[PDB]
Symmetry: D2
Subunit: 317 residues, 4 copies
């Protein structure tokens, strides 16, 4: 018998004896993702083309409005907004949601996969809600995941008891559980990084990559993939195995990717799946942010591949 | 004042005073692509999961029957079939069609962008049709193109007059012309290749990659992108500029990509767009096929990038 | 801000301090209705027509499977099944659901509106669950309503605190609250009955109809409508006002419509909206069934119109 | 071996050796109908309800612009426009098109079936086009038909060769031929009329209705059906058999239905189907229009039922 996201979430909220506030939040998210999927796939485009009678701004406006209306949130952090958004008291809940409404927006004109990333924290210090409420390490996440708008739309939800994948059936607007309790392969055979920045890579990265192309024990070199859209690259890593890297380089001395809404949610997802997520020096989830738009270096994926790189880092220290 | 693919195809048939046979064919293609797009985005998956108690194969069958139903074809060549398909004389038209119904199928499980590639030839001769009718150099193509099932579904159609892009509106099931008489940039800033095969590259490719990461004239390095699905990588090249490469290596000294249904269609779109498509030695479109599943090395993209690499190929001549 | 059925149901379950069992049931129903809507609209019909690679049986199979999987039901009564269906102990809940999966199936070949009708009872006598558990008067309903597959799909849900209408947006597969706390007009101007049975009508009905065509006080006669699909006819009555009638006649000495899954749910809906629902002699909801497939006469709609007919009945008694 | 409307229309244009102008027109119609169908079923309604912070009018604009974009028309007559629309000479074709973009609009709020009706004429003359070009008797129609937005969406197209029915597959946006060369039953068992106007009927109609409820030869009475939307009532008549009537009464001694865009198209479909369409005195198709919004009484359906009523009309002659 089939399991829909709505049923699964509700069930999980029942086993946890929640008051149903988080459950409403997750149902709001799902509704928002479906709406974003529909806009991404271009339904109604004929209307802009005058059969007479933006995508990231709309996406932002959908997430914020849909999340507010859930009455389960108090603080919102968007990649798109400079300051955190404080929900009006009438609509307040106890949750802080950190999200990237549409990641990979550059890739839009090229029709490359894009996705939505979100991390959910529970408000701790019960003072008037504010930005500080979002400044929590990723180890403190209640839930995190992402929606990938690729050849099909998928929602990956990670919580304390594991990672689950839900495929969207757009005929009936419902997410079906298709992969339960996901676990990443211990060792993979694909490395993903933008080698265009080779000139700026630190030594450890340089050695690792070359070890991938020319393995000492003449084994098969790793295949390479780099879609340029984090959600797509990280999703392939989780599903097929391997390692994804967006280390520090001159243009981004602290990495390009943001900690709260890109790095943390993906780090959380990887850990629950049995993978590692490091900065090179430390675990991503343990870092305590000081700025909501803070950036951080990130390397994640199969435990053996990440460990192997971490050993190399240590060797140059 | 909107243009649908159906309107466009018909006006073009009228301008060229065709009997309407090629128009029937293009319309059958449009229908097949819409049907594939729907299965790719998983409409109906709830039924496989028991809500009421392959893909490569399904795509092949759709294209074949829809093409036969057009009464415009005599010989069909598919990546999925060992032997060419000779059409029943009852439905025999004059066109030969070579296609890859679902390219990048190994990416399906990862939900990476995938697509359909086709090239159409007019039968040249007057004897019983056979495989031999498909063995024409790409320069003899009447039409060629592809459909990309990415964040949105797109059909790119190349004919003698040029290249046009049609975006699928899944709400009304109509391809809408969105980019007219497309021309690739003279020079791009992205290079695309599986650097996992570094150990195997010939000296010319190696030197080029090097120039891209460490520019000898102190110009900015190129960014790297490699989705792993030709239609996705090529479509990004066409729209954004740059170069895509899949040269020879232990993976056949002859390349991996197939000439008839992958290389030729793309080479044809590139040339009509004002770009180049070469094997490093000769232009892809001039190669005389000798086997329907013949492979060939290919390099395509912005003219200045392709000429640059060709120069290196010559330096090592 | 928008209100989706999922949010509304959850919210209502929260205010009622339910354990979330009914909430899951209602979410199961909604999922089933969306799936039935999609099949009714004919998505995928191209596949039966061989682009190479029942509606009431499928509908039945969807409702039963989806309801079972909710783990909130113990007894199921379908217009389509001879005996009540007892859910396996592992999947048991405390609810008894009486439904017509696809009412108006004759009207299918003519593409006339069809709908789904359901009534929900709470199991009372805690003995092993059985048919007897369904034999409860309609006054004992916890929830009832219907889905109408007309020009657009709508779900009308009635519960103790009122009647609400939700319109299905098939782009995102979500029901949006479009009409809150529905109340029927006190007096209408449309009568709905199949006058083809005039030869068999009892005297009261005969007098009423003629009073509608030739009003004593020369006022405007009532307009007449009779779609032949109860859900459509009753839905127009609720929304626009008037009276619907399916009285007893020779072919159906006790009416055609069934009490448990057609009459009761519609009677419940009408009462909460401020309308009346009578057999001519008694209120529909007060009747205690003795057979699950029992039939009953029914007259419902605006309070003044129904009262006016009831007066006439009394006059001939 | 499936037939889409697009394939059918093209083969028919080829058999008739047309220049492709009428084919472009029919294809533009197919596109408009699909666009209307989508708005009717409310795709996108969530946006009107603020998810991210008319119908008659929208339908008119769609048909008009899509028709003008076809370059096959010179004069357009709409139920919604006081004066006929003369096409800009730049896009002027040779066809005159009369249509009701959304018939039964008063039923919209009740979600009752609704539809689009069109009749196409070839311009006969050689002077500046004008309203006068549309004033042709229905016997001069090149094509006529309708689309019904009911439980499923259907397009019925009538041309010289006969009547065909195409079911819309909303998953791929394609009309699929499902009923070929349709013929109405010689005699039906359903009569359709608004009996609310009994007081106003002429003696002949009154006598007929009477014969249907109380058959003088002791045969079974006819059942009654009256949806209240012409396209719905007529489509049921065509498929199931019977008679539909909207005769004269205080609601204009001249009938309610409009000749050019409601009566003629339907009369034309009926005749091609082997049925009859009369005003009681003369055949609808032979009436010489004298005003574009001229109304006319109509009776259509199975030949034996229409002849029967015509006989009564004569008895009172
Ligand atoms: N649907 C759910 N899925 C998983 N955990 C849940 C769910 N609902 C509530 N919980 C857990 O219970 C806590 C409080 O729930 P709540 O009362 O809804 O705010 C949450 O923070 C989670 O720890
Ligand atoms: N829709 C079309 N678009 C562009 N060229 C066409 C079209 N139809 C026919 N032609 C051209 O005219 C030739 C013969 O058309 P046909 O008679 O249909 O086989 C083709 O092979 C093309 O070169
Ligand atoms: N979603 C809901 N909407 C309205 N009433 C509810 C809801 N959930 C529960 N209730 C009410 O509370 C009772 C018990 O709920 P439950 O524990 O879920 O079985 C039901 O029978 C209703 O009376
Ligand atoms: N697709 C078509 N189906 C049936 N008849 C057509 C079609 N196209 C053209 N014809 C017929 O041929 C005439 C002229 O076609 P046209 O040149 O397109 O204006 C029409 O008016 C019809 O009588
Ligand atoms: O367009 P965004 O939202 O800023 O995302 C781009 C990000 O950019 C990374 C790739 O950037 P580079 O071009 O530097 O490789 C991805 O991995 C992220 O999706
Ligand atoms: O033959 P397939 O399974 O359709 O593979 C697709 C091709 O595979 C190439 C990638 O091959 P590598 O893994 O060797 O890079 C892509 O460009 C082409 O799309
Ligand atoms: O086809 P069903 O499920 O038995 O429903 C038909 C019912 O039949 C009534 C009309 O029947 P008559 O033909 O006797 O008028 C409707 O009001 C109900 O929808
Ligand atoms: O003019 P409209 O609003 O499009 O009305 C539709 C017409 O209205 C007739 C019903 O009229 P009565 O209420 O007079 O029966 C139907 O057959 C026709 O569809
Ligand atoms: Mn963003
Ligand atoms: Mn981002
Ligand atoms: Mn393939
Ligand atoms: Mn391939
Ligand atoms: Mn039924
Ligand atoms: Mn029924
Ligand atoms: Mn109208
Ligand atoms: Mn009208």
């Amino acid at each position: 018998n089939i399991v829909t996201l709505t049923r699964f979430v509700m069930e999980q909220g029942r086993k946890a004896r929640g008051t149903g506030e988080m459950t409403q939040l997750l149902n709001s998210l799902c509704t928002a993702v479906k709406a974003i999927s529909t806009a991404v796939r271009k339904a109604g485009i004929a209307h802009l083309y005058g059969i007479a009678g933006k995508l990231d701004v709309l996406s932002n406006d959908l997430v914020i409005n849909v999340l507010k209306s859930s009455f389960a949130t108090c603080v919102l952090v968007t990649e798109e907004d400079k300051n955190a958004i404080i929900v009006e008291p009438e609509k307040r809940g106890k949750y802080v949601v950190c999200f990237d409404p549409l990641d990979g927006s550059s890739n839009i004109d090229c029709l490359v996969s894009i996705g939505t990333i979100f991390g959910i924290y529970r408000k701790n210090s019960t003072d008037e809600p504010s930005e500080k409420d979002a400044l929590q390490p990723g180890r403190n996440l209640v839930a995190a995941g992402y929606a990938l708008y690729g050849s099909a739309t998928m929602l990956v939800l990670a919580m304390v008891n594991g990672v689950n994948c839900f495929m969207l059936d757009p005929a009936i607007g419902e997410f079906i559980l298709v992969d339960r309790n996901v676990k990443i392969k211990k060792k993979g055979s694909i490395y993903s990084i933008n080698e265009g920045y080779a000139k700026e890579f630190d030594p450890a990265i340089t050695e690792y990559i070359q070890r991938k192309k020319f393995p000492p024990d003449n084994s098969a070199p790793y295949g390479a993939r780099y879609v340029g859209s984090m959600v797509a690259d990280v999703h392939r890593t989780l599903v097929y195995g391997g390692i994804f890297m967006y280390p520090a380089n001159k243009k981004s001395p602290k990495g390009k990717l943001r900690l709260l809404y890109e790095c943390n949610p993906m780090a959380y997802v990887m850990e629950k799946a049995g993978g590692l997520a490091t900065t090179g020096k430390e675990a991503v989830l343990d870092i305590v942010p000081t700025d909501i738009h803070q950036r951080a270096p990130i390397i994640l994926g199969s435990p053996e591949d990440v460990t192997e790189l971490l050993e190399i880092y240590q060797k140059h220290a």
